[PDB]
Symmetry: C2
Subunit: 107 residues, 2 copies
């Protein structure tokens, strides 16, 4: 059902990110990269962003590797990276992404 | 087995691609782009690749937009793009991608 991404807890981000998914050659680890073009939270959030929260029926998945991009003093974008080091983390993440991509589809 | 990717129909590709998923800002279209680093079909390198086939319990999803990718003058890799123009196409592709990613996961 409901799956969302939040930069501040309790606030769902409207902008849909580009998502890049990689898997290590030996199958030991994986990475999901999110790139947000002018996300609402930058439009004067106004609260400082300390993490990204992937929120669904199971709870949260959390990454602290999150960085705003600035041009001439203005945050214009956000990049986030989520690294998975175990089968359980990979499986948990795919479940979230499915719920997210399905409720974030085309018109 | 749930889902596989094929360059030649009937042969499952062993190399797992890097995958990039985009959505147009107005929600009108979406795109998935695939990067295969030296996929077996290139290493063994006999049959000519005319398409990429995404195969699962529901059937196949197909794209003809598939290209040899060169590194230092050598066709060592493949790029593919699958474009979705409708809600039906998006939802169906997400179903494949779930099954593929779930059966292509991590070891120890």
């Amino acid at each position: 059902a409901m799956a969302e991404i939040q930069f501040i807890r309790g606030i769902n981000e409207e902008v849909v990110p580009d998502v890049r998914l990689t898997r290590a050659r030996d199958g030991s680890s994986g990475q999901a990269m999110f790139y947000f073009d002018n996300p609402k939270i930058v439009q004067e959030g106004n609260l400082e962003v300390t993490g990204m929260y992937m929120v669904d029926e199971e709870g949260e998945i959390v990454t602290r590797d999150v960085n705003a991009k600035f041009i001439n003093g203005q945050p214009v974008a956000i990049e986030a990276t989520y690294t998975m080091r175990s089968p359980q983390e990979w499986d948990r993440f795919i479940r979230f992404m499915d719920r997210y991509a399905a409720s974030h589809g085309l018109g």
